[PDB]
Amino acid sequence: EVQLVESGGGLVQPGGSLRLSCAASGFNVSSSYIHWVRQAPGKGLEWVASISSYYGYTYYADSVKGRFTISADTSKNTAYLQMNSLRAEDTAVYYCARKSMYHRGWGWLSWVYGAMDYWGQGTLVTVSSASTKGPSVFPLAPTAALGCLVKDYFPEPVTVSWNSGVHTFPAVLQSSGLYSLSSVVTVPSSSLTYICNVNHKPSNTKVDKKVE
Amino acid sequence: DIQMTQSPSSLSASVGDRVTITCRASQSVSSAVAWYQQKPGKAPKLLIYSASSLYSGVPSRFSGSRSGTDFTLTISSLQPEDFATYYCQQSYYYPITFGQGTKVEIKRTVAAPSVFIFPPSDSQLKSGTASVVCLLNNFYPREAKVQWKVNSQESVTEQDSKDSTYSLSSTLTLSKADYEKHKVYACEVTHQGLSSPVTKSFNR
Amino acid sequence: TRVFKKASPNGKLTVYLGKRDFVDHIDLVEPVDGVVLVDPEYLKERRVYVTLTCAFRYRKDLFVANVQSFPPAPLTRLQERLIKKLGEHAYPFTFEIPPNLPCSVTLQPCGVDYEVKAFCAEKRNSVRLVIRKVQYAPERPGPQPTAETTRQFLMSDKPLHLEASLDKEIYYHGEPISVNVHVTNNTNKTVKKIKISVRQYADIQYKCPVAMEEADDTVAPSSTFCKVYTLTPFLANNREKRGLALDGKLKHEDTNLASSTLLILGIIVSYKVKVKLVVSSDVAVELPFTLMHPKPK
Amino acid sequence: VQLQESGGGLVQPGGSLRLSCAASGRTISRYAMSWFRQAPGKEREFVAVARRSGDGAFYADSVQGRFTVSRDDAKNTVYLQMNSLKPEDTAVYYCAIDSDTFYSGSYDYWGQGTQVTV
Amino acid sequence: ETEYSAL
DSSP states (O other): OOEEEEEOOOOOOTTOEEEEEEEEESSOGGGEEEEEEEEOTTSOEEEEEEEETTTTEEEEOTTSBTTEEEEEETTTTEEEEEEESOOGGGOEEEEEEEEESOOSSSSOOTTOOOOOOEEOOOEEEOOOSOOOBOOEEEEEOOOEEEEEEEEEEBSSOOEEEEOOOOEEOOOEEOTTSSEEEEEEEEEOTTOOOEEEEEEEGGGTEEEEEEEO | OOOEEEEOSEEEEOTTOOOEEEEEESSOOOSOEEEEEEOSSSOOEEEEETTTEEOTTOOSSEEEEESSSEEEEEESSOOTTOOSEEEEEEOSSSSOEEOOOOEEEEOOOOOOOEEEEEOOOHHHHHHTEEEEEEEEEEESSSOEEEEEEOOEEOOEEOOOSSSOOEEEEEEEEEEHHHHTTOOEEEEEEEETTOSSOEEEEEEO | OEEEEEEOTTSSOEEEESOSEEEOOSSOOOEEEEEEEOOTTTOOSSOEEEEEEEEEEOOEEEEEEEEEEESOOOOOHHHHHHHHHHOSSEEEEEEEOOTTOOOOEEEOOOEEEEEEEEEEOOOTTEEEEEEEEEOOOOSSOOOOOEEEEEOOOSSOSSOEEEEEEESOSEEETTOOBOEEEEEEEOSSSOEEEEEEEEEEEEEOOEEEEEEEEEEOOOBOSSEEEEEEOOBOOOSTTOSSOTTOEEEOOSSSOOOOBOOOOOOOOSOEEEEEEEEEEEEOOOEEEEEEEEEEOOOOO | OOOEEEOOOOOOTTOEEEEEEEOOSSOSSSSOOEEEEEETTEEEEEEEEEOSSSSOEEEOGGGTTTEEEEEETTTTEEEEEEESOOTTOOEEEEEEOBOOTTSOOOBOOOOOOEEEOO | OOEEEEO
16 A cells, blocks of 8 residues: 655754655655645645656745755655755644556656645644743632643643643743643532642653642 | 635534535636545545545545536535535646635534633742733634733634533733733623623732 | 547537547557547538548658548447437547557657548548557566676686676566676776666667666675666656657657557667676676556556 | 614414514625523523524524524515414514624624514 | 547
């Protein structure tokens, strides 16, 4: 069966560089078109670039024309996207897809550019001039709602737990650069102890706050 | 480029509803329109190609139709797993352009947000930043508005599981120098299920 | 499902054909069948002739067959349905190309091409549609290409055993070719450099190196050597080569490198892998292989 | 803009009725008007809403399965069909208009209401 | 040019 494997995703400062590798199995990179796509956090799919090895064709979107380059290595059966001059807006999840040039009936359909029928798994790329930090836990005291504000941590993810009604909210990239979220829970006021436990592996920081 | 305008930007449906979604190319595409389905976090799956041709393995309920530049993706009977974001893509020219997604949500009775308000704590005040948190709990549909009366960041929890209801937390952050100048803070929540806005307030 | 159509300038003669790639099977050929729609009022010659020509441009013609669509002097399963859909004013025509005729091929800036024409003879009454003759790859592989030599000089009293081999004979387009090379130098001269190439023989003769791979590997005197290389011949690096034998194309679409000629006029194309040892007097060896397209399944 | 409601009147238990709401000076397609129920004890309760064109008709849990909404942009009027009424349904029904084109819920203009008594 | 239809 056909498979694509993406690699080369990680943090990098703005103005830096990465190199995504898409390894192809079950087919030949020369009989196909290879596409790089990306989806930003809280947005929709966007096509980045495309290559044909056999004919030597390269296309890039207008937002990555010059900062990105696409090439192929048929000896290893792999494709490479060299991402230069990275920026915060490029923070996204990148996917590798392919369109077979077969199925015409005899040979190559060299102008279809058709639908991408096989996808990889998606690798996250981050771009930010910010260093690791540990979460700062603050209380939120008063059916009564009580919570903990886990503010100013970096990078994702941060785990929050209590000791039914718990709603941990998506993290929001504050203008400063760090991450902040809040975990709330609603409990009857008749019984109004609740400990908020915050874990952050990227900094090996664990905090326990008490709300009541 | 070619702009693929999609509609509806989002729709709510039940099990068995005959959903329908429309894409429209800004230029004369020639049946090179593909429809994909992305579930939260995972990768897109090809569903339709060539504007009418089903893809192997895709269920038979999904269907594609063309009436000119107006492409249609139809689902004969929506099923629990047909709750994702569906995109249209023109693979005729370059650059390839997608649509804007269409989150096929769930449908339920209208409910009103229960509003709570939280003022900054002493610990947080020592640091030098004040954060007031207004919590809207259990409100369907998604659309609601929150106004801060004396720089906000709302975060809506994805549709719930037992109920199908959104939560929201609007947090206003200020410097402690400007926080203690004023005395009365409040958040006003207006939701289409509420006759009049609900205001929750505290005194500094 | 689909039927390519081309209307004549007057709109009266509209040629319809199911397909445009007629595959030259080794034993037989696919029948070129179609239907011509005529308006009896416009039909003033009372005779419409359909021809299937095979030209060798550069003009020379290798096979001309005439069948009188109207007036009548069988029908394929598609022709009957096409006539029924188009009414009763359409008449079918068919050609059966004979073996030993060439397959479509062009020279990258010509070559052998085919055409189906229809005209009312007792510009407007002349409609021409271009078709192609092409062939798949052999369904079963041949013996492994192995080639060994032994080149000796007067100064040395021992052999310089050179050997090369490929992993198989059938290599589809856009497929890497592994060239296992072995050397055993008991002589005194220094094996400076090694070269591997994939080269095309297209006899209408010329020899363009489609793929090359040059290694600075050195084998010292009285020593062995074994190494597996890899070449992929494709058209990315073969667009400045005038006279390259390209597969046949319908109008202008980019096509792949000409396939092998399974076996006659026209142009005969084949491909060979060469292993060469440049010595400090260079030894060489060659093997054949088959570069074609697979068969859908 | 001045919304006007029509219909109402005494209807026996278990019957049916149809109220209407017509707008003046503005369209109804780009707006999303709603129907509210004000009864003795809990005033200004939600009944139903119909948004722009055919992209949603949402009912409260109290009137699910026995009410219906239907807009009509040709005459700029919408209809609330009440069916299978019960004695605990007796109130003044008001017609609000959503000034926001994003389902926000900023009701501004209401009219006067119509008293349905069962 | 090579037009197009159906069957």
